Amino acid sequence: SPASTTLMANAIRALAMDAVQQANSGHPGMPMGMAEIGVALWSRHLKHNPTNPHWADRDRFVLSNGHGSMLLYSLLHLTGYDLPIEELKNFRQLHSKTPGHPEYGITPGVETTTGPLGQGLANAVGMALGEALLAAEFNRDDAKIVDHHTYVFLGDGCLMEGISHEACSLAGTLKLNKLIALYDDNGISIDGDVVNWFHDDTPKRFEAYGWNVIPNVNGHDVDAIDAAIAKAKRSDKPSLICCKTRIGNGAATKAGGHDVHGAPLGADEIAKTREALGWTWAPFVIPQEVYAAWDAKEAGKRSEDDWNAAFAQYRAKYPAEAAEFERRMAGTLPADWAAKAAAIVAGANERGETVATRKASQQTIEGLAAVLPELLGGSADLTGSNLTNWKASKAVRANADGPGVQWGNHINYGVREFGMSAAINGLVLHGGYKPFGGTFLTFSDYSRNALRVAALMKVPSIFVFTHDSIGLGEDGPTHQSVEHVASLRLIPNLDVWRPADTVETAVAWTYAVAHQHPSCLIFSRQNLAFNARTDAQLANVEKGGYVLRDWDEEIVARKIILIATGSEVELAMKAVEPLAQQGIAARVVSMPSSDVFDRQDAEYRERVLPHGVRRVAIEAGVTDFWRKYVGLEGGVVGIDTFGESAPAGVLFKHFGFTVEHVIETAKAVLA
Amino acid sequence: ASTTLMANAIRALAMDAVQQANSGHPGMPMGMAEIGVALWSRHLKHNPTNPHWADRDRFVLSNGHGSMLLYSLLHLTGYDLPIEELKNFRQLHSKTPGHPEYGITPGVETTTGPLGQGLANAVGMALGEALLAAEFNRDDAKIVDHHTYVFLGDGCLMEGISHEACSLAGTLKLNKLIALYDDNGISIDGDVVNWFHDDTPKRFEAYGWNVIPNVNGHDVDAIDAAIAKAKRSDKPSLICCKTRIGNGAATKAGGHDVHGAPLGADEIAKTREALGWTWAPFVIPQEVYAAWDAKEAGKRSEDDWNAAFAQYRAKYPAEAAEFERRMAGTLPADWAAKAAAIVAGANERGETVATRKASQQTIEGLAAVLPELLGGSADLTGSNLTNWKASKAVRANADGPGVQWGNHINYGVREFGMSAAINGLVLHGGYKPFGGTFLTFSDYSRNALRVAALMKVPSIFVFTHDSIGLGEDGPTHQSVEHVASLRLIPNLDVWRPADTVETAVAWTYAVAHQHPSCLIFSRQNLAFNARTDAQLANVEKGGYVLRDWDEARKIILIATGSEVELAMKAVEPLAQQGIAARVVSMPSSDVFDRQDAEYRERVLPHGVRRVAIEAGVTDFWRKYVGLEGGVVGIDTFGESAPAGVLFKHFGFTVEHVIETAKAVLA
Numbered sequence A: 001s002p003a004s005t006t007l008m009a010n011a012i013r014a015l016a017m018d019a020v021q022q023a024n025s026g027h028p029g030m031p032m033g034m035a036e037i038g039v040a041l042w043s044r045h046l047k048h049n050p051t052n053p054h055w056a057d058r059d060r061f062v063l064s065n066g067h068g069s070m071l072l073y074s075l076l077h078l079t080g081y082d083l084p085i086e087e088l089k090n091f092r093q094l095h096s097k098t099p100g101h102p103e104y105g106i107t108p109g110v111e112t113t114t115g116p117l118g119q120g121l122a123n124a125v126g127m128a129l130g131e132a133l134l135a136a137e138f139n140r141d142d143a144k145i146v147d148h149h150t151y152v153f154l155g156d157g158c159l160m161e162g163i164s165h166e167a168c169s170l171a172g173t174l175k176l177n178k179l180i181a182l183y184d185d186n187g188i189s190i191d192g193d194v195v196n197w198f199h200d201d202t203p204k205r206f207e208a209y210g211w212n213v214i215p216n217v218n219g220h221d222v223d224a225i226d227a228a229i230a231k232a233k234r235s236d237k238p239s240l241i242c243c244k245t246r247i248g249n250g251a252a253t254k255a256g257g258h259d260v261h262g263a264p265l266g267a268d269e270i271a272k273t274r275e276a277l278g279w280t281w282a283p284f285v286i287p288q289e290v291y292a293a294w295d296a297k298e299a300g301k302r303s304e305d306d307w308n309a310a311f312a313q314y315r316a317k318y319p320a321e322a323a324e325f326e327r328r329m330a331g332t333l334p335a336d337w338a339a340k341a342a343a344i345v346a347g348a349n350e351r352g353e354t355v356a357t358r359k360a361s362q363q364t365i366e367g368l369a370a371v372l373p374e375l376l377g378g379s380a381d382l383t384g385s386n387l388t389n390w391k392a393s394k395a396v397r398a399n400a401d402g403p404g405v406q407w408g409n410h411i412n413y414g415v416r417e418f419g420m421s422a423a424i425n426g427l428v429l430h431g432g433y434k435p436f437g438g439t440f441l442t443f444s445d446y447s448r449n450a451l452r453v454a455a456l457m458k459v460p461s462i463f464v465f466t467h468d469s470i471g472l473g474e475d476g477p478t479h480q481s482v483e484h485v486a487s488l489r490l491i492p493n494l495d496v497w498r499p500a501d502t503v504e505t506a507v508a509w510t511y512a513v514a515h516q517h518p519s520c521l522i523f524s525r526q527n528l529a530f531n532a533r534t535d536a537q538l539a540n541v542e543k544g545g546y547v548l549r550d551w552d553e554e555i556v557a558r559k560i561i562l563i564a565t566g567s568e569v570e571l572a573m574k575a576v577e578p579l580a581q582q583g584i585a586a587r588v589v590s591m592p593s594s595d596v597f598d599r600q601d602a603e604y605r606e607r608v609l610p611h612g613v614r615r616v617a618i619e620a621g622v623t624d625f626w627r628k629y630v631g632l633e634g635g636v637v638g639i640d641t642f643g644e645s646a647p648a649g650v651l652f653k654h655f656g657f658t659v660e661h662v663i664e665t666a667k668a669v670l671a
Numbered sequence B: 001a002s003t004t005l006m007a008n009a010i011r012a013l014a015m016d017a018v019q020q021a022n023s024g025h026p027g028m029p030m031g032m033a034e035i036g037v038a039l040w041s042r043h044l045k046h047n048p049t050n051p052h053w054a055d056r057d058r059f060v061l062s063n064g065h066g067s068m069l070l071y072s073l074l075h076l077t078g079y080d081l082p083i084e085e086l087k088n089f090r091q092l093h094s095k096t097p098g099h100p101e102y103g104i105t106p107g108v109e110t111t112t113g114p115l116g117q118g119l120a121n122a123v124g125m126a127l128g129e130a131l132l133a134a135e136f137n138r139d140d141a142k143i144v145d146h147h148t149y150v151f152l153g154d155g156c157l158m159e160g161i162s163h164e165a166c167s168l169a170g171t172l173k174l175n176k177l178i179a180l181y182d183d184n185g186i187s188i189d190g191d192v193v194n195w196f197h198d199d200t201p202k203r204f205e206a207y208g209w210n211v212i213p214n215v216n217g218h219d220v221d222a223i224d225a226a227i228a229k230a231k232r233s234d235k236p237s238l239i240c241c242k243t244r245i246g247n248g249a250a251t252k253a254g255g256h257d258v259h260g261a262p263l264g265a266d267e268i269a270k271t272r273e274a275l276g277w278t279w280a281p282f283v284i285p286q287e288v289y290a291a292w293d294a295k296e297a298g299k300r301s302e303d304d305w306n307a308a309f310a311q312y313r314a315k316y317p318a319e320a321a322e323f324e325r326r327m328a329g330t331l332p333a334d335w336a337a338k339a340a341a342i343v344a345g346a347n348e349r350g351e352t353v354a355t356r357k358a359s360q361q362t363i364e365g366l367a368a369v370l371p372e373l374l375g376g377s378a379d380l381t382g383s384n385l386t387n388w389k390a391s392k393a394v395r396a397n398a399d400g401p402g403v404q405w406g407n408h409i410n411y412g413v414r415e416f417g418m419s420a421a422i423n424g425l426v427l428h429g430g431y432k433p434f435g436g437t438f439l440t441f442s443d444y445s446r447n448a449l450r451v452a453a454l455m456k457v458p459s460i461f462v463f464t465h466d467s468i469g470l471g472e473d474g475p476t477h478q479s480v481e482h483v484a485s486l487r488l489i490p491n492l493d494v495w496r497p498a499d500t501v502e503t504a505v506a507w508t509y510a511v512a513h514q515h516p517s518c519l520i521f522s523r524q525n526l527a528f529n530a531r532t533d534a535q536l537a538n539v540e541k542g543g544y545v546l547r548d549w550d551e552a553r554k555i556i557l558i559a560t561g562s563e564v565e566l567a568m569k570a571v572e573p574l575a576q577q578g579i580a581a582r583v584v585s586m587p588s589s590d591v592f593d594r595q596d597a598e599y600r601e602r603v604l605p606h607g608v609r610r611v612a613i614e615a616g617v618t619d620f621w622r623k624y625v626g627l628e629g630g631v632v633g634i635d636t637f638g639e640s641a642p643a644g645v646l647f648k649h650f651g652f653t654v655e656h657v658i659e660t661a662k663a664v665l666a
């Protein structure tokens, strides 16, 4: 007898309930509820190769309800990915390939890192947009190389989160019809029956976004779910399949209950569940016929083999394009990257312009685009204000007459910071593009956890933020960042650049673009003075903090270091001659990135900030951050309150960003 | 004077004030001028003379960039906002900042500017009115009855927070909330249809809202009729007002340039001509003042309510005194002693429990003395431990509009909408609200925490699961940078208590403090610490000496929350190595920073070196330990493993404390 769908689904049940029991921790409800959905999608529709999780044209799957991780670990194991049974035995254990929520980079087949509800859905919107752009860009009438679907499992949690609204409204407007969402519709969240706090007509909601909805599907009928996916694959709109399930389905006593979401079933309940399901095998034992029914290694090999032959036929007709496709899918920059980056930094230096760093950024974007065809910019409805767009770009737009998008390389995201940012994580994960997205610095508070997840996954998302201080002027304290620059530096693995002029901007951008981890690039509204640099100083900008103005040789005056960033570098420099007329010799250290500076070696950090010489930090943001560089004995010229609505000039004088206050602070520090 | 003249007065003030400041947003106020007339002039119940009248309708400007609209309305209808202040739009110390600010201007109910949050505040205000009515009203005497109006645009509707707020408001059947949508087809990048093609009426019906689609947004009578229909509604209402951004402008109306830039003098002169507005900038003729002014109607309205309240007091003296107490945000009478008893109880019990359980234990005690206490959780009630045995769940009525009364709210998975709704509840008066979620997901709600801090209102945000100590859920949940990142927000108190006693102090301080608070609790059990009565009295100073030097080489160990235990366990082993350790517990560094210099010097004397110990990023501690001190923390994301395994793996051990201390004293 070969395996029935019931036996295939019950294997998921058994692995889930057993792994959770073993760890005494985790979530058996969702995996047990979603088991028939897993069979229908994975065994009948998903195009993938377990032997090569990196195959360019694989379907992308995302588990947005990430707490149900054992569902993904079961499917991966059963269908033949390199995730052995011993790894499932070590669910939720230190250094296992089975962490409590799935982690990209940790486990083969895991496309993104989930756990924070709602972000998977948005990642998946990004992945579908990437497929759609990459298809419009690379496919030719006589040779197709891009064609895959994007699948996402999600629950009540993701649908309640505001980010689902941002993502799905945008996906509906852009007609991303190869995105197919399967909703685990089980009527229950952690607090109990969802109807008491979440009574949406969800089908009607998604129709309003311009999605196709298949409501009221029996989530325990494989054939019905299978049929719903097949209809979805014929749809001219993104689809939502509402799969009515019972949470913890199959459990003897606890199914549909308020206690199966996120605690182990208990040994008795498992024993009773085994008998109720007729599942006779011991924990982590899977019978041969169950592996044989699930295993995807043969079909995965045929699929990738046909694709490789298709790509070979495409290379013969389109060799330059085929090589571009490979390079870009790998996330590799051009072979002559070092030359091309240097041309961009050098042009910034030749021009010697005094402009706002948001304008510097746009000038640098212009130069990047000319050599990076993968460049993909965008803004959360602040295009003309962030200056994220370039003259030769083309805006992404839905096709007027059918599904999908016309190719473009700049995206209007709408007023959707968080959705934009998690979409960018998706775009970066998909491969083929180098994406970035802008908003005002303070509204990093809206997209924050997406910046964090990018930093956790270690993918090189680029987040542009403009209007970075009181320097923005009249829009006032709701808009003026104070705490943000420092608060972003706190996130592990997230580089923060706050350049002082065109040259630092070109370095920040070129560095960010080549770096493996994500970056925040922070620009001013207001014009900042250009700084002339020697060759030695130019070479040191990329070290994050460097000596911009040194003391003269063999001097006699009392020494101070001024450490400044961004718009405050200008203030530090205007303070040098005045400090000298006061008997104080001021070195100016510019620190466009403290994160990068901290990675420099000890000899170099000691050369920039010599022990025993006192320091004043200068930055239009909270002061406490600076104590790591200035100590208890040092000073800081900064801002520890919210701002005020007035012109920038007025605000800078009001808040003590003046030569006089710098002098006074330096004198206090030297006393 | 005609309604056209009334509307154009808003146009003139808005375009002229933006020109004078050479800065601001004339588009929206010009586009919404008739909507302003219909609501403010024909439906809004309010007394310009007393902005704090308890039973006033609440108005929220969610599309806060259109601030000149509100300043105009406030000025025309007779609030204490003189023409001189409109002349000083966007200037230092004016009562007319670029986005409206609660506390700065009379009649400004909340601070907006961050899109979407106004809408969520209004959901909170309407929930406040509804709960208070169900609680205080009686069959023979009504004292609570008012509507909540919110102006909003495309930005607010795109923001995910609008989904959170409106989905919750629909399920709770808050039928007195009335939202007027400035439906103008434009956002900053241009034609919204290219990035925002939602059928918004259909979306809102899906939430359980009543929708009045396709209203002519320049026809006062039609908008008026829609507002009237909405006041008759079973459900919250969205009135979709079709408008032209910059409407009335001579040549630029409906353009992509009127959102956020001055019209220019040329355009203004021509607009004066096309409108037939003959008066010079900031000059309003007396007939327009006479048509707009609401002083007399406002006085009759509040006088009628004042009488109904007196009729209520004669029948319900005790309930009436409670109403006045709570609307004013005043604590109960023997408050100092009741709070002292709650602390003393935690001290007497001496239990070792998680601070999440401590928190629940304190909530039990707070609830017994604060009938105004209003808890809730973002779908983590049994995990945050935000409810208490006697609490009752807020629920929609089964059969009609509105809610049954309750004092714990299930917010669903909506950290940001919950938090901004809590701000609204606080601003409304009548309750002492709080809401919980996991600490890391403060990232979702972050900007609402910030706005509570800007408005200086005492919102309470509960966060549990505060570090690697949460264990198996792993690095997406395990907070690392959060504690320090919340300390950086100005005016936001952050408490991270070590045990039941610190928890009791943190909670009682938060309840009586004017600024908002983050209360941060552990998932795992934390050891109880015995305190002298003098140590007890210093807990509310935010940092204090928990274990003093024995009257060997001196060090100070500064520790917070769950790490106080590791600091205390290190004292004896450090003694065996010739180091005399003082332990300073710092449950709130923010509160500590506010103490006077003598006290701070007493706790942290100059010249004694310091090691900080906290399960979070290490750099923050340099403000206290200096370049020469040490930190025992975590500067990477965590891992998925049991808590005990994590603490060992990440160096939270006595050995590491000793080693750091010796490095520091070298």
Ligand SMILES: Cc1ncc(C[n+]2csc(CCOP(=O)(O)OP(=O)(O)O)c2C)c(N)n1
Residues within 6 Å of the ligand: A029, A030, A065, A067, A068, A115, A116, A117, A118, A154, A155, A156, A157, A158, A186, A188, A189, A190, A247, A261, B378, B379, B380, B413, B441, B444
């Ligand atoms: C942003 C965020 N907030 C809160 C949580 C904690 N949490 C995890 S699952 C969940 C409930 C969502 O339940 P649902 O998605 O309906 O999953 P089911 O229990 O039905 O599997 C919550 C509140 C989280 N993981 N992420």
Ligand SMILES: Cc1ncc(C[n+]2csc(CCOP(=O)(O)OP(=O)(O)O)c2C)c(N)n1
Residues within 6 Å of the ligand: A380, A381, A382, A415, A443, A446, B027, B028, B063, B065, B066, B113, B114, B115, B116, B152, B153, B154, B155, B156, B184, B186, B187, B188, B245, B259
């Ligand atoms: C959270 C947030 N993100 C971004 C912005 C910047 N911003 C202000 S108004 C606006 C456009 C909103 O357009 P709409 O609400 O339709 O305004 P209209 O110009 O039509 O009044 C944007 C993107 C903001 N104020 N708040």
Ligand SMILES: O=P(O)(O)OC[C@H]1O[C@@H](O)[C@H](O)[C@@H]1O
Residues within 6 Å of the ligand: A384, A385, A386, A475, A525, B065, B188, B259, B260, B261
């Ligand atoms: O002049 P910038 O700062 O680019 O824009 C100023 C204002 O104009 C609008 O675009 C934005 O809403 C912002 O508030």
Ligand SMILES: O=P(O)(O)OC[C@H]1O[C@@H](O)[C@H](O)[C@@H]1O
Residues within 6 Å of the ligand: A026, A067, A190, A261, A262, A263, B382, B383, B384, B473, B523
């Ligand atoms: O066991 P605690 O930490 O209370 O919470 C249980 C966990 O499992 C679920 O209930 C929650 O999502 C949380 O992740």
Ligand SMILES: [Br-]
Residues within 6 Å of the ligand: A280, A281, A282, A285
């Ligand atoms: Br067996």
Ligand SMILES: [Br-]
Residues within 6 Å of the ligand: A391, A392
């Ligand atoms: Br060009």
Ligand SMILES: [Br-]
Residues within 6 Å of the ligand: B189, B190, B191, B194
């Ligand atoms: Br457009």
Ligand SMILES: [Br-]
Residues within 6 Å of the ligand: B552, B553, B554
């Ligand atoms: Br000593």
Ligand SMILES: [Ca+2]
Residues within 6 Å of the ligand: A155, A156, A157, A184, A186, A187, A188, A189
């Ligand atoms: Ca559910």
Ligand SMILES: [Ca+2]
Residues within 6 Å of the ligand: B153, B154, B155, B182, B184, B185, B186, B187
């Ligand atoms: Ca608009």
